Amino acid sequence: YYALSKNLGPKLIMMMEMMKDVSTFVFLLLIFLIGYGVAAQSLLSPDEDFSSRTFIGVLFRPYFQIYGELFLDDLNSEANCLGDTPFTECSRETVRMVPFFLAVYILGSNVLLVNLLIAMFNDTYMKVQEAAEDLWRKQNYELCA
């Protein structure tokens, strides 16, 4: 019902145009999310039979960490590190690499990919804005009919 409006209608047409850039962002993130997730879940929990909970943990924490919710208190609890500093005095020395992997990961996801999505949207909007207005004007008669 927003397609009738002269402001909301062309924007809807451009949203459908940007969906390909959204798909491009999803394909690039999927790479870093599954790579970091398999690596991080294995470092946090070595010595555990594979189950459905392993798969959730790989998909669950890496995805929300890209929206700023960093589960560092929760990762500190899972790593069994008893020090005042968050990643010191741990049972295994390998689990202290989890914040490093995470740092690289959020550098890949927030710093690099999100800002490139902003760049692709600005370029895509400037390219297809006039075509969207013309297509909305044809759809104005289609909706009237």
Binding site: L28, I31, F32, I34, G35, Y36, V38, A39, A40, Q41, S42, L43, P46, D47, E48, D49, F50, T54, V58, R92, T94, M97, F101
Partner: protein
């Protein structure tokens, strides 16, 4: 047109993938040519070799990911032996394309060949770390620590 091997129907990802998975059910019917000749033509297409390379690397990523997530056994497991055979095969392919196809300078110029060397190197260090003392708990944790680095690189080789 050269990518698709002079064909007009199998010219998308899904069409070549569907024909690749079901050879005897989609190839006789969807014949373009711009039975034996068509079978010899489709599988020599460069795109088909890509989809074979893509599926092979995807299974490698999934199998290696399962191996690093699941716990290591007290002896060298069956999946570990399969991965050992797979990475030797990868190592022999990298050496042949170095010594006997382009040249050492041409090979090392490419950034993906350098990443390939880093992958093979990471797996062999982690494997030998585990295989030196398979019942040692410390060897298993370090081995998984090196193999964490090994999985991120496999998922980037999908960017290629």
């Amino acid at each position: 047109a050269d990518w698709y091997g002079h064909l007009k129907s199998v010219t998308s990802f899904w069409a070549v993938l569907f024909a690749f998975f079901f050879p005897f059910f989609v190839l006789p019917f969807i014949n373009f040519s711009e039975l034996r000749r068509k079978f010899a033509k489709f599988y020599s297409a460069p795109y088909t070799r890509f989809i074979s390379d893509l599926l092979s690397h995807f299974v490698l990523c999934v199998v290696t990911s399962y191996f690093v997530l699941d716990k290591l056994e007290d002896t060298i497991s069956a999946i570990e032996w399969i991965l050992l055979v797979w990475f030797v095969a990868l190592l022999l392919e990298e050496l042949r394309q170095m010594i006997f196809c382009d040249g050492i300078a041409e090979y090392i110029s490419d950034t993906w060949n350098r990443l390939d060397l880093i992958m093979i190197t990471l797996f062999f260090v982690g494997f030998f770390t585990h295989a030196s003392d398979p019942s040692n708990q410390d060897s298993k944790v370090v081995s998984k620590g090196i193999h964490a680095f090994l999985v991120v690189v496999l998922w980037l080789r999908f960017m290629r």
